[PDB]
Design an enzyme around this catalytic site. Structure first.
Site, PDB file in Angstrom:
ATOM      1  N   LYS D   3      47.326 -12.641 -46.995  1.00 16.12           N
ATOM      2  CA  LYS D   3      47.099 -13.946 -46.396  1.00 16.12           C
ATOM      3  C   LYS D   3      46.809 -14.964 -47.486  1.00 16.12           C
ATOM      4  CE  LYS D   3      47.775 -11.793 -42.697  1.00 16.12           C
ATOM      5  NZ  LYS D   3      49.218 -11.560 -42.415  1.00 16.12           N
ATOM      6  N   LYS D   4      47.352 -16.163 -47.322  1.00 21.76           N
ATOM      7  CA  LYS D   4      47.317 -17.139 -48.393  1.00 21.76           C
ATOM      8  C   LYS D   4      47.094 -18.515 -47.794  1.00 21.76           C
ATOM      9  CE  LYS D   4      51.063 -15.689 -49.603  1.00 21.76           C
ATOM     10  NZ  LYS D   4      52.391 -15.250 -50.092  1.00 21.76           N
ATOM     11  N   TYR D  61      56.043 -21.878 -31.814  1.00 25.42           N
ATOM     12  CA  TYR D  61      56.375 -22.425 -33.127  1.00 25.42           C
ATOM     13  C   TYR D  61      57.588 -21.720 -33.716  1.00 25.42           C
ATOM     14  CZ  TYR D  61      55.924 -23.124 -38.200  1.00 25.42           C
ATOM     15  OH  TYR D  61      56.172 -23.392 -39.525  1.00 25.42           O
TER      16      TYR D  61
END
Lengths: 157, 157, 157, 160
Positions: D3-4, D61
């Site tokens: 995760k970033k 999305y």
DNA sequence: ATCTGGGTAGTATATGCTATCCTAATTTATATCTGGGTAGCATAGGCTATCCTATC
DNA sequence: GATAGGATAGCCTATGCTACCCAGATATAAATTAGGATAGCATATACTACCCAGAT
């Protein structure tokens, strides 16, 4: 309060400046400036003028004083009452000595073109205002003979 | 005499002296018939008898009242100064002399003129305290809209 | 001096406020010019009004005014308009592209009254200066259905 | 994991080429390619909006990015939420501005005979595969009027 | 030496001046009547493995 | 044996919803000055017969 003085030391013809008469005169001579007019004449002999009548007394007198200030080269008669003229129709005509309630003052000038201009200016000045002012009628005068009173044959004055 | 005889302002009439003066006037006026009356009712000229003295002028006023039916008289009034020789500069526009005048209005040029001419000639026939009477042909084109309501119009027509 | 933070009012608190109160009063005065029902029996949302343009604050205020004026309306949040096809056969922008222009959408039940509300909002905006006139309004017709039957009866549970 | 965060280059409303979005776009286009239509207007007037809603936030999305690269002329907007609506029972009714957790995003299409086909494709291709995505019901706005067709400034291509 | 007319005091009443209230644009506050900007709750559209089933 | 595929971030990009407190245009009551007018001594007549001396 009450009147600030019954007698002010001013006889007939003793008329000084006043803000109301100042404004009336300024309005008149602004109206009198709409055309090229002459306030006086070389000989300065009174053979013409303006006749102003009708309306309330206190408005007629003020109009008289305003015409005086606007034209310092004029001559003014006092106010007075009027009789009753000829009635329309064949009825009982009035008497010569009878007194009405309509006032009048008369103007004495020299020429007649300027007198007509002054009458027109007074008509416009009245027409701009309501109150008894509009009731004040104005007509012309032409004293072809003269209203002669020795006018101090002009030197430097 | 003197004192309030109860008669109000403007209650006069016939008298032998004024009768004779008016007889002279009308005799001069009867030398040539004129339209002494107008259809429109309102007149186009007035009368400006000035000079003489106050008493002579009032007597002539009565003699003109009892002279013709087509004549109505104002109270006598005074005249503005031409130019006062008393002071140095010119007097004010309102400055009024001691020469008196009164106003009665006559239609038509000739009828207006002849009354004044007869007044002048009659006072010339008289002594001098009245020979200083001079009148003018004050003709107005637009005319004067005098009130035609006669005093008996309240209860008569 | 006092700013506006989180007041605890979630997405949907249409609390009264004098600005929104008078805006809604004007709207329902405009909405009173026609006789159209403000609701429908089944209450299914298949129509509404689309309002965009102008500044963000003007658009939000207009949305709140429409909310208070019609308590039988459903209003979407504001967001940013896309970059529709402008004239000129050149490098057309990305389909996802969004403009800097805001918008909000109204969810009503019928279409005649929806058009009435659209016209009323148009007039209400037109009677105003400032960036308000920059706000544009168009119509909606959700013939398919934005149906979302809730399961939470907030009145009692 | 992995995760970033941080800047990734592209800005708001900009498409991207991803294998998942590529497959979704291919499915929609293939469904859209079974009948030729006027994907745009000769004067560029949009008379039919699109209101993809339902499902979940992530599944919507992703559907937005999948519809970005499958239709010639479309005007998909950022995702937003939806009002609550009715209430359980005849009498009670919720507030006017009350907004539910069902999300949506606005698209626009020219003509009324292509927007419905987009609706059908974007519904079937994304609902008849994933359980959490089998609730994206589409209510494509079948307008009878127009919208702001040129909401654009002269600086095209972010240049002149 | 009478004529003769002809002007003429001595009051109630209208004036030239000076004084004192309605109006009339003329400001001038006075409230309004809308647009800025105020944050957590929500929100886009990017990333490199993460995915964890879910699927072959 | 990775992958379909949503979903997964978390700070990048930056949206908005609730409600406002200020920040000005915009009518708009209310003043406000200023322009009109309305008023007293002291003269000016009108009326009063009568005087009353030119004027012989």
């Amino acid at each position: 309060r009450r009147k600030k003085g019954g007698w002010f030391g001013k006889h007939r013809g003793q008329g000084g400046s006043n803000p109301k008469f100042e404004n009336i005169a300024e309005g008149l001579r602004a109206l009198l400036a709409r055309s090229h007019v002459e306030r006086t004449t070389d000989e300065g002999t009174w053979v013409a003028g303006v006749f102003v009548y009708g309306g309330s007394k206190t408005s007629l007198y003020n109009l008289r004083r305003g015409t005086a200030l606007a034209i310092p080269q004029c001559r003014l008669t006092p106010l007075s009452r009027l009789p009753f003229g000829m009635a329309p129709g064949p009825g009982p005509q009035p008497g010569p000595l009878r007194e009405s309630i309509v006032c009048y003052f008369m103007v004495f000038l020299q020429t007649h073109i300027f007198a007509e201009v002054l009458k027109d200016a007074i008509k416009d000045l009245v027409m701009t205002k309501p109150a008894p002012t509009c009731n004040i009628r104005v007509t012309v005068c032409s004293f072809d003979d003269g209203v002669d009173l020795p006018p101090w044959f002009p030197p430097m004055v």
